[PDB]
Amino acid sequence: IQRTPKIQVYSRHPAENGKSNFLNCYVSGFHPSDIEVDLLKNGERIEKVEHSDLSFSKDWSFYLLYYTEFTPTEKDEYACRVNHVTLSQPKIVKWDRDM
Amino acid sequence: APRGPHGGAASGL
Amino acid sequence: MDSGVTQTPKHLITATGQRVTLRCSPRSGDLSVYWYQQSLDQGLQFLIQYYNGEERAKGNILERFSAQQFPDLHSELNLSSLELGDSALYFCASSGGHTGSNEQFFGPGTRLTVLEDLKNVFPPEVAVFEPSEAEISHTQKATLVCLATGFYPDHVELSWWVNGKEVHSGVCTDPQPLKEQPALNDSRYALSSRLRVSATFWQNPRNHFRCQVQFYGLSENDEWTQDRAKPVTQIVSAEAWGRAD
Amino acid sequence: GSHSMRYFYTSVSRPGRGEPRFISVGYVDDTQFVRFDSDAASPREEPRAPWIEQEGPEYWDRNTQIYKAQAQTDRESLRNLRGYYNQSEAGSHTLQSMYGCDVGPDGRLLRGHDQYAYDGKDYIALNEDLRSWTAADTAAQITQRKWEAAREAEQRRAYLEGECVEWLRRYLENGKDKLERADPPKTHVTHHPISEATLRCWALGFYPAEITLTWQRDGEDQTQDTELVETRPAGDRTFQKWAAVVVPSGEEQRYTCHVQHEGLPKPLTLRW
Amino acid sequence: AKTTQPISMDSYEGQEVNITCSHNNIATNDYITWYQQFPSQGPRFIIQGYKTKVTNEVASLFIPADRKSSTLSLPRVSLSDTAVYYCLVVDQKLVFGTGTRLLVSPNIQNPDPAVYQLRDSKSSDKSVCLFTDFDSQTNVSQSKDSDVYITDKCVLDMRSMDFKSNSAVAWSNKSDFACANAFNNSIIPEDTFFPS
């Protein structure tokens, strides 16, 4: 009680079109642990999204990595959608290849 | 390995 | 603490094929309860452990053995379809509270004797033997000897009482009784004890020596069909009085 | 250098939905190697690193029973905690545990840890001497008295000086080539006009997570408007980090990025 | 793992008693643990250790670096310490072996070995014979007959007189049985006083 999630969307490897990669959404710094995280492709939730095991930092705040295997594309738009008890509405963060 | 009780039952808290 | 682990009843004699339930209360503050079985000349064997109502650990426990821990943390171990080999000391232990994390607090135990029939259960005969005059002359001490004989099963508590008050000083009762008939199992048992006092104490006719044997037998609900008095849990005494001689 | 083994317990109570969820994760340094989840199909300790897989059945069996018992204990603890704070029987609360050992290059104990948080705040910690507790709270004082009577600290010390050091030793031996690993970062700089312009110092694929990225002005650091994101997991047991300065398009050949990481023989200096 | 320890040990009061335990396959999580038990009573925790020597109010526990052995050391035993001592290596379950049964004997050094007769009640069947005031090195044997009953030696403490003494009892219903030949299956001292 009660910390807001910090969100980073990024690829495991530097993104190149046609070559397979992993899409990560790292949520961290939040409390309590209950949290909803989806990965989006052109606005809709991806099915095959795994996540790491629930852990926490030295300040007791939780962190989780959600990820999925994908191949990036010029036209395709990926995002992360996060809901948590500290959020009015879901926060959507777009994957920007340069961050 | 995680901590076991060494022959009794855990603290409580 | 303040109260240690308790177990009820102290003893139990019951026919093969039957069912018994043993009761235990953990030491004050402890949330975890253990059950152990001690067969003759063996270490305790772990049966089952509960924590706060929930089963935590199992030993090599037969499915006819079944246990439970209630919200008040007391526990019940019911032994079903009893057979001869179930005859043992059943110990209860506790931890997870006031008792240290690495320790178990053991109760006094419940003794279970399983018999194929409750007919070769006999109460003891108590006999007090007066001091030897030779001993009084040679040592100025006087040893009284008690004998409790022909009882089954092996579950007696012998005590000495002098002038109405139980004594322990000068007393030695045998560690384990004798079998009155060896190899003939379901043998009755014999047990001796000794009380040594000063000759001057013994020769004083106002001193009263009672040897008492608490025996644990059948209850008043046990079906008793035979010629003999019902060998129920009872006390059998024998006594002597001071002799100036 | 130094190494640490650490366990992280999280237990969450539910309103009227049965038994709390217990989850545990184990780390050696920045590498996770075991997990346990009470809400799994069958609650079982599972491996999460290659160097722990060699452990035989008895290891996972035993550790699993430990986790189960600990889950029960955490439940009763959540009950007591609800009691101490006069919280309602319907609320959902969190109990977190954090313990383990740090050893040096000789593999002998350097420091021990064992501490608890309730609903995200420090509740009670084992002191550096490993003999007493610091209670943060009036409730934690109740816990403190209870443990002081039962001399629990001695048992925690027994673990932290005993099995903890031994197991950490065995894990460092078995996973040597990945735990005594030091992967220097792969680094590069990117730029985005807006256009004020943006410089980005990238560090990827490094281990352990500890790293320093600084943007300097002719040799004096611009912490000021360096935008520095958290070190993040790449998902392959390596980490990533980047720093950013937005500058104008003027005098850019004195913006320097400096990367320090124990896998680097010497600190790196980067420029676009 | 399992533990192997002495089946029995003898001692006189006042001595140090050292009981060693073997556990070659002690596991990393196992703690060396000792329990004491009096007959048909709940066993009691004595002491526990991992790597280093442990000393508490009741005993000491020596632990070699290998951890393959351990020694329970009782500083100065008394008759009260006659009991079974269990060595265990413990993670979750207490697995009890047979344990070492320790007998603590008195130093009887005012020995006055004798055999006395006792006649009540009434009278006198059986007649009880009492072999007493012998020293603790003397051993008492079962009779060659089994119509004749012989007790093992028994230590009584007349605390009012600071006097400890050994005793055995033998009785039979037989006409044939007499005190003078009751215990002559045991190596009986020829100092033994036979009255009458």
Placement of tokens 């030695």 in the chain: C172
Distances (CA, A) of C148 to C158, C187, C229: 8, 14, 18
Cβ–Cβ contact A84 with D under 8 A = no
The residue type found at C177 is P
| Least Cα separation, residue C121 to chain E (angstroms) | 20
- Give me the DSSP letters along chain C: --S--EEE-SEEEEETT--EEEEEE--TT--EEEEEEE-TTS--EEEEEEETTEEEEE-S--TTEEEEE-TTS-EEEEE-S--GGG-EEEEEEEESSSS-TT--EE---EEEEEES-TTS-B--EEEEEPPPHHHHHHHSEEEEEEEEEEEBSS-EEEEEEETTEEE-TTEEE-SSPEESSTTSSS--EEEEEEEEEEHHHHS-TT-EEEEEEEE--B-TTS---SSSPP-BSEEEEEEEE----
Which of chain C's residues have a Cβ under 8 Å away from the Cβ of B10? 96, 101
Which element (helix H / strand E) includes D123? strand D121-126
- Which tokens is C135 given? 């001993």
Distances (CA, A) of D82 to C166, D74, D77, D119: 52, 12, 8, 11
Closest CA to D35 of A53, E151, E115, C110: A53
- Most A CBs within 10 A among D85, D232, D239, D246, hence the mutation to make, goes to D232
Closest CA to E13 of E117, E137, E107, E143: E107
- Which tokens is C79 given? 């032994």
- Which tokens is D143 given? 């816990």
Burial of D251 by CB count in 10 Å (0-12 exposed, 13-18 middle, 19+ buried)? exposed
What ranges do the domains of chain E cover?
1-106, 107-196
Which element (helix H / strand E) includes D231? none
Please name the residue of chain E whose CA is at the shortest distance from the CA of residue C155. E40
- Chain-centroid distance of CA C163 in Å reads 25
- Chain-centroid distance of CA E163 in Å reads 19
Q: Check whether D159 is labelled as a binding-site residue.
A: yes
Q: Distance between CA A45 and CA A79 in Å, rounded?
A: 9
Is the bond into E122 cis (omega within 30 degrees of 0)? Answer: yes
All domains of chain A, ordered by start, with CATH?
Answer: 1-99 (2.60.40.10)
Which approach determined this entry?
X-ray
* E neighbour chains, 3+ CB pairs within 8 Å: B, C, D
- Which tokens is C216 given? 């644990």
What ranges do the domains of chain D cover?
1-181, 182-269
Closest CA to C103 of E29, E43, E12, A65: E43
Cβ–Cβ under 8 Å, residues E46 and E90: no
* Contact of chains E and D by CB distance (3 or more pairs under 8 angstroms): yes
Cβ–Cβ contact E146 with C under 8 A = yes
Give the one of C43, C102, C107 whose C-beta lies nearest to E48's C-beta. C102
* Contact of chains C and E by CB distance (3 or more pairs under 8 angstroms): yes
Cβ–Cβ under 8 Å, residues D196 and D245: no
Which element (helix H / strand E) includes E19? strand E17-22
Which of chain D's residues have a Cβ under 8 Å away from the Cβ of B1? 59, 62-63, 66, 163, 167
Which of chain E's residues have a Cβ under 8 Å away from the Cβ of B5? 92
User: CB E161 to CB C143 under 8 A?
Assistant: no
Residues 6+ apart with CB under 8 A from E123: none
- Which tokens is C221 given? 């609900």
Closest CA to E27 of D54, D62, D64: D62
DSSP state of D40: S
Provide, for chain A, the percentages of residues in helix, strand and coil under a 3-state DSSP scheme, each rounded to the nearest 5: 0, 50, 50
User: CB B3 to CB D7 under 8 A?
Assistant: yes
All domains of chain C, ordered by start, with CATH?
Answer: 1-116 (2.60.40.10), 117-245 (2.60.40.10)
User: For C32, how many CA atoms within 13 A lie in the half-sphere containing its CB?
Assistant: 31
Q: Check whether D46 is labelled as a binding-site residue.
A: no
Closest CA to D225 of D204, D239, D245, D210: D245
Touching C: B residues 1-13, CB under 8 Å? 5-12
**Angle (deg, nearest 10), helices D138-150 and D152-161:** 80
Closest CA to D62 of C30, B1, A8: B1
Give the one of A28, A31, A52 whose C-beta lies nearest to D230's C-beta. A28
- Angle at alpha carbon of residue E18, lines to E17 and E23, rounded to 5°: 150
Give the one of D66, D69, D162 whose C-beta lies nearest to E51's C-beta. D162
Give the one of C52, C57, C100 whose C-beta lies nearest to D150's C-beta. C100
Closest CA to A97 of A10, A7, A6, A17: A10
Strands D109-118 and D94-103: antiparallel
For residue A44, the SS3 value is strand
Which of chain E's residues have a Cβ under 8 Å away from the Cβ of D67? none
Domain E1-106 in CATH: superfamily? Immunoglobulins (2.60.40.10)
Cβ–Cβ under 8 Å, residues A84 and A63: no
- Which tokens is E45 given? 């925790």
Strands E31-37 and E44-49: antiparallel
Which of chain D's residues have a Cβ under 8 Å away from the Cβ of C50? none
* Contact of chains D and C by CB distance (3 or more pairs under 8 angstroms): yes
Q: Which residues pair with C243 in a beta bridge?
A: none
How big is the C-E interface in CB pairs under 8 Å? Answer: 138
User: CB C96 to CB B9 under 8 A?
Assistant: yes
For residue E174, the SS3 value is coil
Q: Distance between CA E68 and CA E22 in Å, rounded?
A: 6
Phi-psi region of E180 (alpha: psi -120 to 50; beta: other; left: phi over 0): alpha
Cβ–Cβ contact B4 with D under 8 A = yes
User: CB B7 to CB C96 under 8 A?
Assistant: no
Phi-psi region of E136 (alpha: psi -120 to 50; beta: other; left: phi over 0): alpha
Q: Distance between CA E130 and CA E195 in Å, rounded?
A: 12
Distances (CA, A) of C111 to C219, E40, E160: 15, 9, 35
Give the one of C52, C57, C102 whose C-beta lies nearest to D76's C-beta. C52
CATH number of this structure's domain D182-269, picked from the four choices 1.10.3720.10, 2.60.40.10, 3.30.565.10, 3.65.10.10 = 2.60.40.10
- Most C CBs within 10 A among E46, E167, E172, hence the mutation to make, goes to E167
| Least Cα separation, residue D244 to chain E (angstroms) | 49
Q: Would you tell me how many other CB atoms lie within 10 Å of the CB of residue C183?
A: 7
- A36-47 burial, b if ≥16 CB within 10 A, otherwise e? ebbbbbeeeeee
Q: Would you tell me how many other CB atoms lie within 10 Å of the CB of residue C176?
A: 10
For residue A90, the SS3 value is coil
| Least Cα separation, residue C34 to chain D (angstroms) | 14
Cβ–Cβ contact A86 with D under 8 A = no
Q: Distance between CA D157 and CA C181 in Å, rounded?
A: 57
DSSP state of E12: E
Strands D21-28 and D31-37: antiparallel
Burial of C165 by CB count in 10 Å (0-12 exposed, 13-18 middle, 19+ buried)? exposed
Determine the straight-line distance between the first and last CA of chain E, rounded to whole angstroms. 61
- Angle at alpha carbon of residue D51, lines to D45 and D52, rounded to 5°: 20
Domain D1-181 in CATH: superfamily? MHC class I-like antigen recognition-like (3.30.500.10)
Please name the residue of chain B whose CA is at the shortest distance from the CA of residue D162. B3
- Which tokens is A15 given? 């993104």
